[PDB]
């Protein structure tokens, strides 16, 4: 039992300070960035995402919580009412590494179904990186179909 | 816009949104103490919706917009031997997504033609003060105040 | 929200005539038995599976509750607990008329679900007549699947 | 028999079954009233697991038979810091389909594997005095009685 509750200022520029390494790496492990160019852009990217932070307009930022002391992992939709089939983006998901491994994610996703139709959301949908077959399992054991997808080859 | 019996699953998602809502809305009117809102809000629902979907002579619907379409919910309650056979919305609303797209007045035609059908012949709703837009809606469809109240923080 | 409660004795023998006399008309309906054997048949198929009723042992029949005040409906499963693959079948299951046609029935299923793990079953299996097609395709929507079809020909 | 990780939905599993079970458990050894019997078994676990997997110094773990099959639960507390490095089995047992197939032994073998293999020096546990299968179980893997519990109804 996952519940969503807003995140913190203290949880998010912590989460904030992992997410943009994270996301380096991750790029610069598919291909699409080089070392030396990483840091830079990943930054850029998050800067222009969350210019606000929390206050971003649109954006919502939760804590997976499994009781008062237990936050589990985060999760991080946009979501645009005026979008024309309602659709909300899950811009990042996961668990902090002591929690994982005991099937928190299936049911903090479960969480993310109920609170995404009760804000009239009707559709999910998100990116996530070829290597990360582990999530890829994950995302089609949950309902999720691929929809499309990016290929590569160094000539 | 239709309005259909309102489904489990449809139930669970609007105490989901409601639930939250009213607690910021009694916050907003001055009613609830922040602290207290979100338990008072809890209690409210169950009391009034002791048996759920099944409490008796209440109504709830949700707000359909095309054969595939979920968009808000209309709940009232209507004692079937009330003298002047009234119904009382309970709730009324739309999610996020649908406001400001006439599906509201839609709606109201829709209770209209449906409690005539059932032998409502007056409804009656509680709005908070502070929604000047809800206010204007009902304005414009009909509805005159009966009561106020008003408060004062000294 | 159904829970699953231990059917009581008035629900039970109340449920115990439905069934039979239920049970009869869909043979009919489905050409198995004729009419005039029907009666008979359902009777000596619902004594030999019940001969000691609610007391016959490894039947779990069970009201479906919304809450103290609704039952919605009724469960019926038979777990041998020496099966081989820890299978349980549904006998019958359904919803009291007025409890129709609100979702209640996948939301029942969801709590079999768990109170069959519970008891350590693996697998849980059905009988369903053919032209119960909205039995057919709920089942189908719960995680069911077709294993075995039997089909007829009037010459 | 293999220990894993007990997974959440496991674990869901696993409370729905130990909690009805250590009620009736409760009520045949004449500790708990009936009437009282789910509310206070509900009431114990929960005061055991605040935070369910969670909790510190817990380690509860699904009994697994072959890498497909899972058969039971093992739950132990063992306080890092405890001066005999003692465990407490909190519960242990196997669904009803898996049991005298010898599960039990071969779980408790794993269990003195782990136990070494996790600094744990002693492990000690409650059985209620009418389960005499799993006194003489206990009895047969070197457990010895420590302490009893009796009582009479005037």
């Given at each position: 039992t996952i519940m969503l509750t807003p995140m913190q200022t203290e949880e998010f520029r912590s989460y904030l300070t992992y997410?943009?390494?994270?996301?380096?790496?991750?790029?610069?492990?598919?291909?699409?960035?080089?070392?030396?160019?990483?840091?830079?852009?990943?930054?850029?990217?998050?800067t222009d995402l969350l210019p606000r932070g929390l206050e971003t307009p649109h954006h919502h930022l939760w804590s997976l919580k499994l009781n008062e002391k237990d936050?589990?992992?985060?999760?991080?939709?946009?979501?645009?009412?005026?979008?024309?089939?309602?659709?909300?983006?899950?811009?990042?998901?996961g668990l902090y590494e002591p929690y994982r491994g005991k099937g928190y994610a299936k049911q903090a996703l479960a969480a993310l179904d109920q609170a995404a139709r009760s804000m009239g959301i009707r559709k999910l949908s998100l990116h996530v990186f070829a290597h990360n077959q582990t999530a890829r399992k994950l995302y089609e054991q949950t309902g999720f179909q691929e929809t499309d997808v990016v290929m590569s080859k160094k000539l």
């Open positions: 997410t943009t390494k994270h996301y380096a790496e991750e790029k610069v492990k598919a291909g699409t960035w080089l070392p030396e160019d990483a840091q830079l852009l990943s930054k850029q990217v998050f936050i589990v992992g985060w999760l991080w939709i946009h979501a645009e009412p005026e979008h024309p089939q309602q659709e909300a983006f899950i811009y990042d998901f």
